[PDB]
Design a protein around this ligand. Structure first.
Ligand SMILES: *[C@@H]1O[C@H](CO)[C@@H](O[C@@H]2O[C@H](CO)[C@@H](O)[C@H](O)[C@H]2NC(C)=O)[C@H](O)[C@H]1NC(C)=O
Ligand SMILES: *[C@@H]1O[C@H](CO)[C@@H](O[C@@H]2O[C@H](CO)[C@@H](O)[C@H](O)[C@H]2NC(C)=O)[C@H](O)[C@H]1NC(C)=O
Ligand SMILES: *[C@@H]1O[C@H](CO)[C@@H](O[C@@H]2O[C@H](CO)[C@@H](O)[C@H](O)[C@H]2NC(C)=O)[C@H](O)[C@H]1NC(C)=O
Ligand SMILES: *[C@@H]1O[C@H](CO)[C@@H](O[C@@H]2O[C@H](CO)[C@@H](O)[C@H](O)[C@H]2NC(C)=O)[C@H](O)[C@H]1NC(C)=O
Ligand SMILES: *[C@@H]1O[C@H](CO)[C@@H](O)[C@H](O)[C@H]1NC(C)=O
Lengths: 71, 228, 310
């Protein structure tokens, strides 16, 4: 349970090849979380690819009224 | 109308529940309160430092030492306490500037989202802005941004223009779409197909220059009237 | 636009006293100045990461550009990521990256440059393949000529003006982006802001370090010299003088860092607003997204900042 990062040496956490949202930021793209204590590389977001073509258009057929807060 | 009203009511209820069920929602206001309390507590805790003197109590310094050196000790304590108080004032000024910036932003948000409808993207919430509702909070304000979000999209085939009788027709406000066999014109933000006529299209030049133009007919509303 | 500074940290005990333990014993007499300074520097450090998070992490989907790069004659090769580079940086981003060059540490940023580049690539792919719809909900694909026709319609020019002059518009755009590459390459003072940020941080740290060699009115700058050449009773006075001088120096450094952090936060808020309003949509505000009637903008990552192509 010894891991080497760009910030330094992390002792006491397991490195996992999985990716999650950041919980406890370490530095240089490494985050730690307690699921024992694990260390991983934070996931930037859910990957998506949009079907671009030069004669295709996507038009909404419905809508949703959304309410959000701001403090 | 009824569907939109139902969605709005459900969204408001969900806002109430989400605020009730998340502890760190008001973290910014809680941080303001905590910062002020912590600064005051640090200032009052700093009063128990010797600053290199023989004691941190003025009465002991005065009742134990001859004034010629008692004044040196008192000078040490006075300058240390004055320095700490200066540090407190400076950090308070910096925090006041930060809060001033936040309050200016809040006033702008009020004037532009509450007193009107804002075209600025993501300024008044995520999505197309409809309206905002202010709510008061301790040391702050809370905005409820009502926004319009498209959903349930569908693929279509589009063309920039329609060539008819050697003329090119362009949509007035909509877009040309095809369901596979027939062409319609619909507004961009909501699928509502309509027959392509000369009322919702305008003509400009021939169909030799536009790239991607397609052949189709353009119905004339005036022809059937004269056909009778 | 600058976005973040260098995250720095201080060790109050090591800076003030080095490794003399009785000096630390005397330093305990001063209370919680060290805790105050550590707290302020930690606040600045987390604020920098928050700044970058606000500016760049605006989309929760990592959009990918299609393998075929035909967009109706428009050429985005100068801003799209280059797979040939090991770092997967666009030519403009690569040029920008190349052109910008004792108890005190410099903490690494939370987001590596690869992650920031991946955000910028996602934003570019979303704005090329879907217009502004991806910033307001699900991404709805639309052919690029039609999107640019929409954007002319947004500034009071009808669509036929675009559709009749598409080749000329594409050529003008390609020539303009080439000129941007050349101008950014040939002029060094164009990136003055990020370089000034780097220089300010470096010189502040250097001056703070140089302050360790000041007598501050005492007889020596070395604690062990005070110990050996002087008996304790006024060696205490000399140590107190040196300690209070060094504490004043560190206070000055922290205060200037706080003010500079406030300025950088204002700049980062401005950059986030510019991203949201010029990249994720089309802005009617005059001179907010360039000189002229705005059509679209493209983000490019730079060291300690962001570059917009209006
Ligand atoms: C548009 O979406 C709304 C929901 O956002 C749909 O309304 C739902 O319709 C189903 C079937 O009629 C009902 O069981 C639900 O209770 C409705 N929800 C609400 C909130 O009223 C609506 O049918 C959709 N319209 C189209 C054309 O797809
Ligand atoms: C495309 O739209 C046209 C116009 O609505 C469709 O043609 C009509 O389709 C309905 C039901 O699909 C029929 O009841 C009508 O008799 C049709 N009218 C004509 C003149 O054809 C057409 O079916 C649609 N195509 C697809 C693939 O959905
Ligand atoms: C749209 O209509 C025009 C005119 O009817 C078509 O142009 C003709 O195309 C055929 C086939 O290439 C030629 O033999 C004729 O000489 C053309 N006539 C004129 C007046 O140009 C055009 O081809 C149609 N569009 C498509 C996609 O077929
Ligand atoms: C798009 O722009 C790029 C860059 O300007 C073009 O790449 C150039 O291609 C020519 C011949 O193919 C080379 O001689 C140049 O050296 C290339 N430029 C660079 C910077 O390497 C490209 O041809 C343009 N068009 C397309 C369709 O990609
Ligand atoms: C669409 O793109 C393909 C290449 O991706 C190209 O070969 C084709 O000509 C394009 N179609 C139109 C109508 O421009």
């Amino acid at each position: 349970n010894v891991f080497q990062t760009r910030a330094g040496c992390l002792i006491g956490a397991e490195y996992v090849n999985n990716s999650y949202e950041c919980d406890i930021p370490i530095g240089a793209g490494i985050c730690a979380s307690y699921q024992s204590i694990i260390a991983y590389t934070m996931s930037l977001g859910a990957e998506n690819s949009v079907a671009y073509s030069n004669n295709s258009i996507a038009i909404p057929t419905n809508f949703t009224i959304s309410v959000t807060t701001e403090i | 109308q009824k569907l939109i009203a139902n969605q709005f009511n459900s969204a408001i209820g969900k806002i109430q529940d989400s605020l009730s069920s998340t502890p760190s929602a008001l973290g910014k206001l809680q941080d303001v309160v905590n910062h002020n309390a912590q600064a005051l507590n640090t200032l009052v805790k700093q009063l128990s430092s010797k600053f290199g003197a023989i004691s941190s109590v003025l009465n002991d310094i005065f009742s134990r030492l001859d004034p010629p050196e008692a004044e040196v000790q008192i000078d040490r304590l006075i300058t240390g306490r004055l320095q700490s108080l200066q540090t407190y004032v400076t950090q308070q000024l910096i925090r006041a500037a930060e809060i001033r910036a936040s309050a200016n932003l809040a006033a702008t948000k009020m004037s532009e989202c509450v007193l009107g409808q804002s075209k600025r993207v993501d300024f008044c919430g995520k999505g197309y802005h409809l309206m905002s509702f202010p709510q008061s909070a301790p040391h702050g304000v809370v905005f409820l941004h009502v926004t319009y979000v498209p959903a349930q999209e569908k693929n279509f085939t589009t063309a920039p223009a329609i060539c008819h009788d050697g003329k090119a027709h362009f949509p007035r406000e909509g877009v040309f779409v095809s369901n596979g066999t027939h062409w319609f014109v619909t507004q961009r933000n909501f699928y509502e197909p309509q027959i392509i006529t000369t009322d919702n299209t305008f003509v400009s030049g021939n169909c030799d220059v536009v790239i991607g133009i397609v052949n189709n007919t353009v119905y004339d509303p005036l022809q059937p009237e004269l056909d009778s | 636009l600058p976005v973040s500074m260098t995250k720095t940290s201080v060790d109050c005990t090591m800076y003030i006293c080095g490794d003399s333990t009785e000096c630390s014993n005397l330093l305990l007499q001063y209370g919680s100045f060290c805790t105050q300074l550590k707290r302020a520097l930690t606040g600045i450090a987390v604020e920098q990461d928050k700044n970058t998070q606000e500016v760049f992490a605006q989309v929760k989907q990592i959009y990918k550009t299609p393998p075929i790069k035909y967009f109706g004659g428009f050429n985005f090769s100068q801003i799209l990521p280059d797979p040939s580079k090991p770092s997967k940086r666009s030519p403009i981003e690569d040029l920008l990256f190349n052109k910008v060059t004792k108890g005190l540490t410099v903490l690494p940023p939370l987001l590596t440059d690869e992650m920031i580049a991946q955000y910028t690539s996602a934003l570019l792919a979303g704005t090329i393949t879907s217009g502004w719809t991806f910033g307001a909900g699900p991404a709805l694909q639309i052919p690029f000529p039609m999107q640019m026709a929409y954007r002319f319609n947004g500034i009071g020019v009808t669509q036929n003006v675009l559709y009749e002059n598409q080749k000329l518009i594409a050529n003008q755009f390609n020539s303009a982006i080439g000129k941007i590459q050349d101008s950014l390459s040939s002029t060094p003072s164009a990136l003055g802001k990020l370089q000034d940020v780097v220089n300010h941080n470096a010189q502040a740290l250097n001056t703070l370090v140089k302050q360790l060699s000041s007598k501050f009115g005492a007889i020596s700058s070395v604690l062990n010299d005070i110990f050996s050449r002087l008996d304790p009773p006024e060696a205490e006075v000399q140590i107190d003088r040196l300690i209070t001088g060094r504490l004043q120096s560190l206070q000055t450094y922290v205060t200037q860092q706080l003010i500079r952090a406030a300025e950088i936060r204002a700049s980062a808020n401005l950059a986030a607003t510019k991203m949201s309003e010029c990249v994720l949509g089309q802005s009617k505000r005059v001179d907010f997204c360039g000189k002229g009637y705005h059509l679209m903008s493209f983000p490019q990552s730079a060291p300690h900042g962001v570059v917009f192509l209006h």
